[PDB]
Amino acid sequence: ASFSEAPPGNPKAGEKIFKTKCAQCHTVDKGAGHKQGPNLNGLFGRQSGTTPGYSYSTADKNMAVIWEENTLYDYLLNPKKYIPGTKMVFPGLKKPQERADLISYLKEATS
Numbered sequence: 001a002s003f004s005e006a007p008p009g010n011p012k013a014g015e016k017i018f019k020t021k022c023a024q025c026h027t028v029d030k031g032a033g034h035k036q037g038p039n040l041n042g043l044f045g046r047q048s049g050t051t052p053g054y055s056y057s058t059a060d061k062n063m064a065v066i067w068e069e070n071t072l073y074d075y076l077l078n079p080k081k082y083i084p085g086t087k088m089v090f091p092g093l094k095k096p097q098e099r100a101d102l103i104s105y106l107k108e109a110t111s
C-alpha cells in the first residue's frame with residue numbers, strides 16, 4: 001500500500017519497464033536535454049517542477065513534491081490523481097513490484 005511494504009526492487013527488471021513505458025518522453029542522462037517530458041537526471045531528492053529549461057504545468061510546480069522512493073511509489077500508481085492538472089499522459093503502473101523495480105532502476109540511472 002506504501003513504499004514501505006513494497007517488494008524489493010531489481011534494477012534490470014526496472015530498466016525494461018523504463019524503456020517500454022517512459023523512455024519515449026524522458027531522458028535520464030546529464031546533458032541529454034528534454035523530450036515530451038523533462039530529463040530526470042538527478043531526480044532523487046529534488047523538488048518537483050524545477051529542472052531548468054522545461055515548461056512545467058502549474059500543478060507540477062505548485063505541488064513542490066520532493067521526489068524520493070516514497071513519493072515516486074505513490075505517484076506512479078496514478079500520476080493524474082497525484083498531481084491533478086499535470087500534462088504527463090500516463091495511466092499509471094498498477095503493480096507494487098513494477099513500481100519497486102522501476103524505482104530501483106531510476107535510483108541508478110538518474111544518478
Ligand code: HEC
Pocket residue numbers: 018021022023024025026036037038047048049050051055056057058059060067076085086087088089090093102
Ligand atoms: C509522455 C507521454 C510521458 C510518459 C510516457 C511519461 N511521462 Fe513523465 N512526464 C511527462 C511530462 C509532459 C511531464 C511534465 C508534467 C507537468 O505537469 O509538467 C512529466 C513529468 C514527470 C515527472 C516529474 C518530474 C519533475 O521534474 O517534477 C516524473 C518523476 C516523471 N514524469 C516520471 C515518469 C516515469 C517514471 C514514467 C514511466 C512510468 C513517465 N514519467 C512516463 C511525460 C511523460
